[PDB]
Amino acid sequence: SSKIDFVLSVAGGFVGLGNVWRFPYLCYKNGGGAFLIPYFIFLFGSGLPVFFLEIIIGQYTSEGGITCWEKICPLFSGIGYASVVIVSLLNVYYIVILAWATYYLFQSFQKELPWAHCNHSWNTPHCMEDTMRKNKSVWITISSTNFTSPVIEFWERNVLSLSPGIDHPGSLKWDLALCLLLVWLVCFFCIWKGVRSTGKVVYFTATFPFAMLLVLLVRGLTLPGAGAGIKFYLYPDITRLEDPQVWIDAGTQIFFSYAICLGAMTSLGSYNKYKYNSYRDCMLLGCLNSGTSFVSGFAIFSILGFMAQEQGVDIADVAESGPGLAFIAYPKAVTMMPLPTFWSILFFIMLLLLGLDSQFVEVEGQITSLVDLYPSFLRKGYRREIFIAFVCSISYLLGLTMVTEGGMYVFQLFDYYAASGVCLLWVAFFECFVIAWIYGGDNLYDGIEDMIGYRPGPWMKYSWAVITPVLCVGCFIFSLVKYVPLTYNKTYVYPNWAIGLGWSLALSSMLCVPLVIVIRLCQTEGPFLVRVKYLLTPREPNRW
Ligand SMILES: CC(C)CCC[C@@H](C)[C@H]1CC[C@H]2[C@@H]3CC=C4C[C@@H](O)CC[C@]4(C)[C@H]3CC[C@]12C
Ligand SMILES: CC(C)CCC[C@@H](C)[C@H]1CC[C@H]2[C@@H]3CC=C4C[C@@H](O)CC[C@]4(C)[C@H]3CC[C@]12C
Ligand SMILES: CC(C)CCC[C@@H](C)[C@H]1CC[C@H]2[C@@H]3CC=C4C[C@@H](O)CC[C@]4(C)[C@H]3CC[C@]12C
Ligand SMILES: CC(C)CCC[C@@H](C)[C@H]1CC[C@H]2[C@@H]3CC=C4C[C@@H](O)CC[C@]4(C)[C@H]3CC[C@]12C
Ligand SMILES: CC(C)CCC[C@@H](C)[C@H]1CC[C@H]2[C@@H]3CC=C4C[C@@H](O)CC[C@]4(C)[C@H]3CC[C@]12C
Ligand SMILES: [Cl-]
Ligand code: NA
């Protein structure tokens, strides 16, 4: 029957740019092995339980993020508002990764891939072919004067034209701005047309990324130096765990790949029927998502090991410890691959297919949720379409700050602060806090038992009550006690203003929870304690 195999292909995609592009870069920046220990702890202690929580709240209440929270606990409706703010910021920068992929795809159509060789305008006199780096280039006859990879030069110089600092915004790169518009135009048209159902080709869309990843994985494993990369990736370095960043990055990557804390999962749960075994699906899909990231990591690290031994440099220093590692490692593998142009086109098409799907869903979700806040006004037939255009246009302009020559720096701030980090922990802690301690985890378990058919094991409630709170709060405090500034590629120190601006992006979402609480307390009438009590009590969430 293969009912199980059918649902995964049809349900929420278990691959995204977070698997292919966010996970490898965060791992690498944090050491290969160490990152994995907090990552798996978070996956089982917070990630999977929160994922299931969001799906079931949505299923129990039959409502999306903003409205579901109001039913479960009225005073905590701010969690839904915060999720919308986080989604709005994510949509602005997630599409920038796609604009880079589109640029690489246009570049790919040439007979010779630009990143493959070094005789080009962007290339510095330092750049040397990687085969040459080991052979007579590095401290052999003339000592290596900081020689660099053609692929790295293409990314930093042709694609990014990286400025010295966020302080120099530089010129708007017209080519990346046009690529961003193309990605945005596709997004608007698919959302406006309402092209959300692709029953016949959903299979190709699901299979294509996995097939491409398998080819990349085989290429890497067959590449000399793969074992060293796999060891770097697999073997943990404990000293790293003593740093707050590895924990925050690992736990948050779990939250990122899962789309938890964005209000997407509550909405997906709402679509599910009341009597559905969502618990089985959440476990399968969450494990598959994490499994994809874990396996993709083998591919990328085997290539990094190869690059490290060709160049003759440490695996840690071979490629960027920043967003853009995928743009260096995977393109290099393609060059090694026979018929490179063909593989490059496929990889960037895959990157595009994974990202676009996610972006369409996220932007539709943002727009729908925003329309729902004021439905009568925004349900006029023209007005919804105008709203979609407005959201797409405003997000495109903000994205323009990131397609400038100093825009990579702005992108790193957005990736670190806007939809990841303390903001995700804050929303997750609150979702777990309210369900576990206000609504009552056991009370939810009565409802889950009715919906799923069987009472769930003690793991979900313990995670909501203790493990997720302790992991989220502990990581937040640890980061503050041992504070380390965001640094781009390990060598760039962000100005103090930039860190404050990044904090504001994190804070805007975070502040929504306390601010709404205050608004609710004021609006309700009565003695303070009575107000709090009424606001705490659930508004008929069973909806039988
Ligand atoms: C998300 C939106 C609404 C608010 C945040 C926008 C931030 C992240 C973006 C938008 C414009 C960007 C700025 C663009 C131009 C400048 C002036 C320059 O001399 C220093 C960099 C600086 C100051 C950038 C910092 C990052 C920046 C402020
Ligand atoms: C805004 C809508 C119409 C989409 C526009 C897309 C077009 C006009 C943009 C987006 C990506 C751009 C390309 C990006 C890469 C290259 C390869 C380079 O060696 C020559 C320029 C060229 C060929 C650019 C030409 C203009 C371009 C194709
Ligand atoms: C609706 C609102 C948020 C749109 C805001 C668009 C802003 C964030 C984007 C769009 C166009 C961008 C500008 C394009 C060109 C320049 C000239 C350059 O010498 C300084 C940076 C600057 C000034 C960019 C700053 C960021 C910028 C102003
Ligand atoms: C929502 C509640 C918990 C407020 C939390 C605010 C805390 C966690 C945030 C908000 C603003 C942040 C500060 C913003 C700017 C700077 C200057 C620089 O030296 C980095 C640290 C520091 C000092 C940040 C530390 C953490 C910070 C103080
Ligand atoms: C409870 C009912 C009345 C809904 C109230 C929603 C209000 C209180 C919430 C929802 C969205 C929230 C806003 C979302 C955007 C931002 C980010 C930054 O620019 C300042 C805070 C601010 C402005 C928030 C303030 C509080 C806010 C306006
Ligand atoms: Cl992940
Ligand atoms: Na994706």
Side-chain angles (χ1 to χ4, degrees):
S1 61
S2 300
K3 293 299 178 294
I4 294 169
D5 208 9
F6 187 65
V7 301
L8 177 63
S9 301
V10 174
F14 42 105
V15 196
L17 296 187
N19 282 178
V20 195
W21 165 90
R22 185 176 179 83
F23 174 86
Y25 111 76
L26 281 181
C27 202
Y28 188 64
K29 184 221 297 288
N30 296 302
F35 184 85
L36 296 178
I37 316 174
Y39 178 82
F40 292 111
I41 290 175
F42 268 91
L43 147 67
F44 291 113
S46 305
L48 275 178
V50 180
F51 180 41
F52 178 59
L53 184 58
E54 295 192 20
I55 300 281
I56 303 301
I57 291 177
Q59 183 168 334
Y60 201 68
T61 64
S62 294
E63 289 295 328
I66 316 181
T67 46
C68 79
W69 271 115
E70 299 165 4
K71 298 187 62 183
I72 301 292
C73 185
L75 192 63
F76 281 91
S77 52
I79 302 176
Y81 295 104
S83 298
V84 167
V85 177
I86 304 179
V87 167
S88 305
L89 294 169
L90 168 72
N91 293 349
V92 177
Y93 63 89
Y94 190 86
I95 191 66
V96 183
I97 324 156
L98 303 171
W100 293 327
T102 318
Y103 191 77
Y104 271 82
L105 177 64
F106 293 152
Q107 294 280 335
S108 78
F109 301 137
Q110 313 163 15
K111 305 299 154 297
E112 165 191 312
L113 303 173
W115 50 90
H117 292 284
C118 189
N119 285 352
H120 304 276
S121 308
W122 59 89
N123 290 122
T124 71
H126 296 282
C127 161
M128 207 132 302
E129 307 277 358
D130 294 344
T131 60
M132 305 167 70
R133 295 201 54 173
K134 206 177 186 304
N135 305 343
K136 303 287 176 181
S137 296
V138 171
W139 299 277
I140 304 290
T141 59
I142 306 179
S143 59
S144 170
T145 323
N146 303 352
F147 296 155
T148 59
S149 179
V151 195
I152 301 186
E153 296 235 352
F154 179 79
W155 165 249
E156 291 182 355
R157 306 188 107 261
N158 189 76
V159 188
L160 296 182
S161 302
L162 199 62
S163 81
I166 190 180
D167 292 344
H168 320 269
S171 71
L172 187 63
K173 299 253 307 173
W174 65 277
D175 38 41
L176 280 185
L178 291 183
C179 292
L180 193 57
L181 191 53
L182 284 172
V183 190
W184 274 115
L185 281 176
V186 169
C187 282
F188 168 74
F189 277 105
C190 296
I191 298 168
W192 170 67
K193 278 301 191 60
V195 187
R196 193 53 262 178
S197 59
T198 39
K200 52 174 184 301
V201 286
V202 62
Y203 313 108
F204 168 75
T205 324
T207 58
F208 183 61
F210 289 112
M212 264 306 297
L213 281 170
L214 179 67
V215 183
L216 289 158
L217 178 69
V218 172
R219 174 73 277 180
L221 300 179
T222 55
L223 295 174
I230 290 171
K231 175 174 300 181
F232 180 72
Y233 180 56
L234 289 190
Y235 283 64
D237 185 20
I238 311 296
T239 67
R240 258 287 187 174
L241 304 178
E242 307 159 3
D243 303 338
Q245 30 197 351
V246 187
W247 290 87
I248 298 207
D249 287 10
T252 284
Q253 167 62 31
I254 276 295
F255 300 157
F256 193 101
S257 182
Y258 283 6
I260 50 191
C261 309
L262 297 180
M265 301 309 141
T266 52
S267 303
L268 283 179
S270 168
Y271 303 139
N272 302 349
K273 46 184 62 178
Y274 186 77
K275 289 299 178 58
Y276 187 67
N277 194 8
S278 51
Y279 191 39
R280 146 198 54 102
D281 280 354
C282 288
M283 299 304 109
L284 291 176
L285 294 177
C287 289
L288 265 37
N289 216 13
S290 285
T292 305
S293 295
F294 189 61
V295 167
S296 298
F298 281 103
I300 200 155
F301 279 85
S302 53
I303 303 161
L304 292 181
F306 166 75
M307 293 169 60
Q309 64 93 22
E310 200 179 10
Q311 303 178 199
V313 69
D314 302 345
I315 311 185
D317 300 336
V318 79
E320 187 184 0
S321 292
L325 172 71
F327 293 100
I328 300 173
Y330 288 132
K332 178 67 182 301
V334 153
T335 303
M336 294 293 141
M337 243 173 294
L339 216 58
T341 295
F342 171 68
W343 296 113
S344 177
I345 294 175
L346 291 193
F347 173 66
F348 293 110
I349 281 183
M350 175 212 82
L351 223 53
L352 295 53
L353 291 186
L354 283 182
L356 278 172
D357 284 8
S358 305
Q359 184 80 10
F360 299 153
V361 171
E362 227 60 59
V363 189
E364 279 158 359
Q366 179 199 359
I367 284 148
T368 302
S369 64
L370 283 171
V371 162
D372 290 352
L373 293 176
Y374 302 101
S376 181
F377 186 88
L378 282 171
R379 276 210 175 99
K380 303 306 188 306
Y382 291 104
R383 290 222 273 264
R384 192 237 177 185
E385 325 161 358
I386 295 175
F387 188 67
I388 300 174
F390 168 80
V391 170
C392 291
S393 66
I394 290 300
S395 303
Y396 170 69
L397 299 167
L398 293 169
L400 292 182
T401 70
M402 282 164 272
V403 295
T404 55
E405 297 181 355
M408 179 75 253
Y409 299 107
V410 194
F411 184 90
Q412 174 71 96
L413 269 181
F414 261 80
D415 209 9
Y416 193 85
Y417 288 107
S420 293
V422 289
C423 65
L424 285 197
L425 301 174
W426 187 269
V427 181
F429 165 74
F430 278 110
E431 291 168 355
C432 284
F433 173 71
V434 178
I435 280 296
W437 305 102
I438 305 170
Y439 188 76
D442 198 29
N443 305 356
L444 192 59
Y445 259 39
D446 297 325
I448 301 175
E449 176 182 355
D450 193 29
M451 292 188 288
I452 266 74
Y454 60 87
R455 171 164 270 260
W459 172 37
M460 292 287 137
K461 50 166 45 174
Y462 291 165
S463 296
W464 302 331
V466 185
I467 316 179
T468 316
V470 166
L471 279 179
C472 291
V473 172
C475 287
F476 171 73
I477 299 181
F478 196 23
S479 71
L480 299 185
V481 171
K482 311 221 314 177
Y483 196 78
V484 63
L486 178 58
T487 51
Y488 167 75
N489 210 0
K490 296 176 65 62
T491 49
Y492 177 76
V493 296
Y494 277 83
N496 294 346
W497 67 264
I499 300 298
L501 167 71
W503 271 105
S504 304
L505 302 168
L507 284 178
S508 50
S509 38
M510 289 166 56
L511 257 302
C512 287
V513 194
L515 282 180
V516 172
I517 288 179
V518 183
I519 303 301
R520 297 304 286 265
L521 287 169
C522 293
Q523 285 172 156
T524 48
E525 297 181 358
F528 183 69
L529 300 175
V530 178
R531 292 174 170 180
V532 173
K533 292 306 290 298
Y534 163 73
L535 288 162
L536 287 186
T537 54
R539 311 174 323 176
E540 296 88 22
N542 307 1
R543 196 216 71 261
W544 286 329

Short mmCIF file of all heavy atoms in Angstrom, two decimals, residues 14 18-20 23-24 27 32-33 35-37 39-40 43 213 217 230 233-235 253-254 257 286-302 330:
data_model
loop_
_atom_site.label_atom_id
_atom_site.label_comp_id
_atom_site.label_asym_id
_atom_site.label_seq_id
_atom_site.Cartn_x
_atom_site.Cartn_y
_atom_site.Cartn_z
N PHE A 14 10.51 17.66 3.60
CA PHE A 14 11.55 17.44 4.60
C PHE A 14 12.93 17.81 4.08
O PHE A 14 13.92 17.23 4.50
CB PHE A 14 11.48 16.03 5.22
CG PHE A 14 11.23 14.93 4.24
CD1 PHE A 14 12.25 14.08 3.86
CD2 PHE A 14 9.96 14.70 3.74
CE1 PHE A 14 12.02 13.05 2.98
CE2 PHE A 14 9.73 13.69 2.84
CZ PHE A 14 10.76 12.85 2.46
N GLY A 18 17.57 24.99 4.69
CA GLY A 18 18.16 24.85 6.00
C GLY A 18 18.96 23.57 6.10
O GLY A 18 20.03 23.57 6.68
N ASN A 19 18.48 22.51 5.48
CA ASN A 19 19.22 21.26 5.45
C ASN A 19 20.47 21.42 4.62
O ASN A 19 21.56 21.20 5.11
CB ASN A 19 18.36 20.17 4.83
CG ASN A 19 17.32 19.62 5.78
OD1 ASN A 19 16.54 18.76 5.40
ND2 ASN A 19 17.32 20.10 7.01
N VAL A 20 20.30 21.74 3.35
CA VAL A 20 21.42 21.90 2.42
C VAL A 20 22.38 23.07 2.69
O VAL A 20 23.58 22.93 2.52
CB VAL A 20 20.91 21.93 0.97
CG1 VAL A 20 22.05 21.74 -0.01
CG2 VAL A 20 19.88 20.83 0.77
N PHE A 23 22.55 24.16 7.72
CA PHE A 23 23.22 23.19 8.59
C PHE A 23 24.71 23.04 8.32
O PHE A 23 25.49 23.02 9.27
CB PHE A 23 22.51 21.83 8.53
CG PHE A 23 23.22 20.74 9.29
CD1 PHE A 23 23.00 20.57 10.64
CD2 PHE A 23 24.10 19.88 8.64
CE1 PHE A 23 23.65 19.57 11.33
CE2 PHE A 23 24.75 18.89 9.33
CZ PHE A 23 24.52 18.73 10.68
N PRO A 24 25.13 22.91 7.04
CA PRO A 24 26.58 22.77 6.91
C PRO A 24 27.37 23.97 7.40
O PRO A 24 28.40 23.78 8.03
CB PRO A 24 26.76 22.60 5.41
CG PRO A 24 25.53 21.92 4.98
CD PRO A 24 24.48 22.66 5.73
N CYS A 27 27.53 24.15 11.22
CA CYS A 27 28.39 23.09 11.70
C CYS A 27 29.82 23.54 11.53
O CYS A 27 30.54 23.64 12.50
CB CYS A 27 28.14 21.82 10.90
SG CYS A 27 28.62 20.27 11.69
N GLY A 32 33.26 20.64 13.22
CA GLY A 32 32.31 19.68 12.72
C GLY A 32 31.64 18.81 13.76
O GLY A 32 30.42 18.74 13.81
N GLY A 33 32.42 18.17 14.61
CA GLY A 33 31.87 17.27 15.60
C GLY A 33 31.12 17.82 16.76
O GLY A 33 30.09 17.28 17.15
N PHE A 35 29.39 20.45 17.08
CA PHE A 35 28.06 20.97 16.77
C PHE A 35 27.01 19.88 16.86
O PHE A 35 25.89 20.14 17.28
CB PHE A 35 28.09 21.54 15.35
CG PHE A 35 26.81 22.19 14.92
CD1 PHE A 35 26.55 23.51 15.23
CD2 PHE A 35 25.88 21.49 14.16
CE1 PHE A 35 25.39 24.11 14.81
CE2 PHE A 35 24.71 22.09 13.74
CZ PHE A 35 24.47 23.41 14.07
N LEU A 36 27.39 18.66 16.53
CA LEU A 36 26.43 17.57 16.53
C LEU A 36 25.86 17.20 17.91
O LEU A 36 24.70 16.83 18.00
CB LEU A 36 27.01 16.35 15.81
CG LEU A 36 27.31 16.57 14.33
CD1 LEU A 36 27.93 15.33 13.71
CD2 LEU A 36 26.04 16.96 13.59
N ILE A 37 26.65 17.29 18.97
CA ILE A 37 26.11 16.92 20.26
C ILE A 37 24.95 17.83 20.72
O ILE A 37 23.89 17.32 21.06
CB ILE A 37 27.22 16.82 21.34
CG1 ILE A 37 28.43 16.07 20.78
CG2 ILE A 37 26.70 16.17 22.61
CD1 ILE A 37 29.62 16.05 21.71
N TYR A 39 23.14 19.53 18.77
CA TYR A 39 22.13 19.40 17.73
C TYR A 39 21.21 18.23 17.97
O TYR A 39 19.99 18.38 17.89
CB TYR A 39 22.86 19.19 16.40
CG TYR A 39 21.99 18.97 15.19
CD1 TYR A 39 21.43 20.04 14.52
CD2 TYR A 39 21.77 17.70 14.70
CE1 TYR A 39 20.65 19.85 13.40
CE2 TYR A 39 20.98 17.49 13.58
CZ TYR A 39 20.43 18.57 12.93
OH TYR A 39 19.65 18.37 11.82
N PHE A 40 21.75 17.06 18.27
CA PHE A 40 20.92 15.90 18.56
C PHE A 40 20.19 16.02 19.90
O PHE A 40 19.07 15.55 20.02
CB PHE A 40 21.72 14.61 18.46
CG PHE A 40 22.15 14.27 17.07
CD1 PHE A 40 23.48 14.32 16.70
CD2 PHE A 40 21.23 13.88 16.12
CE1 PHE A 40 23.88 14.01 15.41
CE2 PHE A 40 21.61 13.56 14.83
CZ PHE A 40 22.94 13.63 14.48
N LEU A 43 17.35 18.18 19.06
CA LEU A 43 16.41 17.51 18.18
C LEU A 43 15.47 16.64 18.96
O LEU A 43 14.27 16.62 18.71
CB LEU A 43 17.17 16.67 17.15
CG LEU A 43 16.66 15.36 16.56
CD1 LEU A 43 15.45 15.56 15.69
CD2 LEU A 43 17.77 14.71 15.75
N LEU A 213 21.39 15.07 -4.25
CA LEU A 213 22.21 14.92 -3.06
C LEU A 213 22.97 13.62 -3.08
O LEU A 213 24.11 13.57 -2.65
CB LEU A 213 21.37 15.06 -1.79
CG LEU A 213 21.03 16.50 -1.40
CD1 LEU A 213 20.01 16.53 -0.28
CD2 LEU A 213 22.29 17.26 -1.01
N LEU A 217 26.90 13.25 -2.81
CA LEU A 217 27.48 12.43 -1.76
C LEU A 217 28.45 11.41 -2.31
O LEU A 217 29.54 11.26 -1.79
CB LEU A 217 26.37 11.71 -1.00
CG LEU A 217 26.74 10.74 0.13
CD1 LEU A 217 27.30 11.50 1.32
CD2 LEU A 217 25.51 9.95 0.54
N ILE A 230 35.21 13.72 6.81
CA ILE A 230 34.22 12.97 7.58
C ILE A 230 34.63 12.91 9.05
O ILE A 230 33.79 13.06 9.93
CB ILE A 230 34.04 11.56 7.00
CG1 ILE A 230 33.34 11.64 5.64
CG2 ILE A 230 33.25 10.66 7.94
CD1 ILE A 230 33.30 10.33 4.90
N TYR A 233 34.00 16.25 10.61
CA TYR A 233 32.57 16.33 10.85
C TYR A 233 32.06 15.44 11.97
O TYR A 233 31.29 15.88 12.81
CB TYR A 233 31.91 15.92 9.55
CG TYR A 233 30.41 15.93 9.51
CD1 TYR A 233 29.69 17.07 9.81
CD2 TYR A 233 29.71 14.80 9.11
CE1 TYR A 233 28.32 17.08 9.75
CE2 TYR A 233 28.33 14.80 9.05
CZ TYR A 233 27.65 15.95 9.37
OH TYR A 233 26.29 15.97 9.32
N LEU A 234 32.45 14.17 11.96
CA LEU A 234 32.02 13.22 12.98
C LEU A 234 32.59 13.33 14.38
O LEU A 234 31.86 13.20 15.36
CB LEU A 234 32.12 11.79 12.47
CG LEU A 234 31.10 11.40 11.40
CD1 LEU A 234 31.17 9.90 11.17
CD2 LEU A 234 29.70 11.81 11.83
N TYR A 235 33.90 13.52 14.49
CA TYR A 235 34.56 13.53 15.81
C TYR A 235 34.42 14.82 16.58
O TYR A 235 34.86 15.87 16.12
CB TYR A 235 36.04 13.18 15.66
CG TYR A 235 36.31 11.71 15.44
CD1 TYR A 235 35.85 11.05 14.31
CD2 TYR A 235 37.03 10.97 16.37
CE1 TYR A 235 36.10 9.71 14.11
CE2 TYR A 235 37.28 9.63 16.18
CZ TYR A 235 36.81 9.00 15.05
OH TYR A 235 37.06 7.66 14.86
N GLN A 253 19.30 25.78 14.77
CA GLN A 253 19.25 25.16 13.46
C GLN A 253 18.14 24.14 13.47
O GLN A 253 17.38 24.04 12.53
CB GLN A 253 20.59 24.50 13.11
CG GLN A 253 20.56 23.57 11.91
CD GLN A 253 20.19 24.29 10.63
OE1 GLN A 253 20.50 25.46 10.46
NE2 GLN A 253 19.54 23.58 9.72
N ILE A 254 18.00 23.36 14.53
CA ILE A 254 16.88 22.42 14.61
C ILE A 254 15.56 23.16 14.44
O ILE A 254 14.72 22.75 13.64
CB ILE A 254 16.92 21.59 15.91
CG1 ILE A 254 17.83 20.39 15.73
CG2 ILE A 254 15.54 21.06 16.27
CD1 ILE A 254 17.30 19.43 14.70
N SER A 257 15.19 24.43 10.62
CA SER A 257 14.84 23.44 9.62
C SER A 257 13.40 23.00 9.80
O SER A 257 12.71 22.73 8.82
CB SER A 257 15.80 22.27 9.70
OG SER A 257 15.51 21.32 8.70
N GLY A 286 10.23 14.76 11.04
CA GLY A 286 11.31 15.41 11.75
C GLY A 286 12.61 14.66 11.66
O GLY A 286 13.66 15.25 11.43
N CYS A 287 12.57 13.34 11.82
CA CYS A 287 13.77 12.53 11.68
C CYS A 287 14.32 12.56 10.27
O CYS A 287 15.53 12.59 10.09
CB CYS A 287 13.52 11.10 12.14
SG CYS A 287 13.32 10.94 13.93
N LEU A 288 13.45 12.54 9.27
CA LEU A 288 13.89 12.62 7.89
C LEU A 288 14.54 13.95 7.59
O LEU A 288 15.53 14.00 6.88
CB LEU A 288 12.71 12.41 6.95
CG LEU A 288 12.46 11.00 6.40
CD1 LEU A 288 12.75 9.90 7.40
CD2 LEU A 288 11.04 10.89 5.87
N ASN A 289 13.99 15.03 8.13
CA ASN A 289 14.56 16.35 7.93
C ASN A 289 15.96 16.36 8.50
O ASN A 289 16.91 16.73 7.82
CB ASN A 289 13.72 17.37 8.68
CG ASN A 289 13.61 18.70 7.96
OD1 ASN A 289 13.97 18.82 6.80
ND2 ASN A 289 13.09 19.70 8.65
N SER A 290 16.10 15.95 9.75
CA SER A 290 17.40 15.91 10.39
C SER A 290 18.34 14.94 9.72
O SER A 290 19.53 15.20 9.61
CB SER A 290 17.26 15.61 11.87
OG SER A 290 16.78 16.74 12.57
N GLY A 291 17.82 13.81 9.26
CA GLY A 291 18.63 12.84 8.56
C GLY A 291 19.18 13.40 7.28
O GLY A 291 20.33 13.15 6.95
N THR A 292 18.37 14.17 6.56
CA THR A 292 18.82 14.80 5.33
C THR A 292 19.96 15.75 5.60
O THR A 292 20.96 15.73 4.90
CB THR A 292 17.68 15.57 4.65
OG1 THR A 292 16.55 14.70 4.46
CG2 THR A 292 18.11 16.12 3.31
N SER A 293 19.83 16.56 6.64
CA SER A 293 20.89 17.49 7.00
C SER A 293 22.15 16.75 7.39
O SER A 293 23.24 17.14 6.98
CB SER A 293 20.45 18.36 8.17
OG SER A 293 19.37 19.19 7.82
N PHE A 294 22.01 15.69 8.16
CA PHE A 294 23.15 14.91 8.59
C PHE A 294 23.88 14.27 7.42
O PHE A 294 25.11 14.28 7.38
CB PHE A 294 22.68 13.84 9.57
CG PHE A 294 23.79 13.10 10.25
CD1 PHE A 294 24.70 13.77 11.05
CD2 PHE A 294 23.91 11.73 10.12
CE1 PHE A 294 25.72 13.09 11.68
CE2 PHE A 294 24.92 11.04 10.75
CZ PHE A 294 25.83 11.72 11.53
N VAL A 295 23.14 13.72 6.47
CA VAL A 295 23.75 13.06 5.32
C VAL A 295 24.35 14.08 4.37
O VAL A 295 25.45 13.89 3.86
CB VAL A 295 22.74 12.15 4.59
CG1 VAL A 295 23.26 11.71 3.23
CG2 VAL A 295 22.41 10.94 5.45
N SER A 296 23.65 15.19 4.14
CA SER A 296 24.17 16.25 3.30
C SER A 296 25.50 16.71 3.86
O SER A 296 26.39 17.08 3.11
CB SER A 296 23.20 17.43 3.26
OG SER A 296 21.96 17.05 2.69
N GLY A 297 25.62 16.71 5.19
CA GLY A 297 26.85 17.12 5.83
C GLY A 297 28.01 16.24 5.43
O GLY A 297 29.11 16.73 5.23
N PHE A 298 27.78 14.94 5.29
CA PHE A 298 28.84 14.04 4.86
C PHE A 298 29.37 14.45 3.51
O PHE A 298 30.57 14.45 3.29
CB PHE A 298 28.36 12.60 4.78
CG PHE A 298 28.30 11.90 6.10
CD1 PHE A 298 27.09 11.72 6.75
CD2 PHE A 298 29.45 11.41 6.69
CE1 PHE A 298 27.03 11.08 7.96
CE2 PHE A 298 29.40 10.77 7.90
CZ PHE A 298 28.19 10.60 8.54
N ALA A 299 28.47 14.76 2.58
CA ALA A 299 28.86 15.18 1.24
C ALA A 299 29.69 16.43 1.28
O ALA A 299 30.77 16.47 0.72
CB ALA A 299 27.63 15.42 0.38
N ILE A 300 29.19 17.46 1.94
CA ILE A 300 29.91 18.72 1.98
C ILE A 300 31.26 18.59 2.67
O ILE A 300 32.23 19.19 2.24
CB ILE A 300 29.02 19.88 2.52
CG1 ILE A 300 29.58 21.23 2.11
CG2 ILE A 300 28.83 19.80 4.02
CD1 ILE A 300 28.53 22.32 2.07
N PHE A 301 31.34 17.80 3.74
CA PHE A 301 32.59 17.67 4.47
C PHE A 301 33.60 16.81 3.75
O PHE A 301 34.79 17.06 3.85
CB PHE A 301 32.34 17.25 5.91
CG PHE A 301 31.95 18.40 6.81
CD1 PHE A 301 30.64 18.81 6.90
CD2 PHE A 301 32.91 19.08 7.53
CE1 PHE A 301 30.28 19.87 7.71
CE2 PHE A 301 32.56 20.14 8.35
CZ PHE A 301 31.24 20.53 8.43
N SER A 302 33.15 15.80 3.02
CA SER A 302 34.06 15.02 2.20
C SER A 302 34.69 15.90 1.12
O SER A 302 35.87 15.75 0.82
CB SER A 302 33.34 13.84 1.59
OG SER A 302 32.17 14.24 0.91
N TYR A 330 29.90 22.81 -2.85
CA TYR A 330 29.14 22.10 -3.88
C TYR A 330 29.53 22.47 -5.31
O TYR A 330 29.63 21.59 -6.15
CB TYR A 330 27.64 22.18 -3.63
CG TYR A 330 27.17 21.34 -2.46
CD1 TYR A 330 26.33 21.86 -1.50
CD2 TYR A 330 27.56 20.01 -2.34
CE1 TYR A 330 25.89 21.10 -0.44
CE2 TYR A 330 27.13 19.24 -1.28
CZ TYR A 330 26.29 19.78 -0.34
OH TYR A 330 25.86 19.02 0.72
#
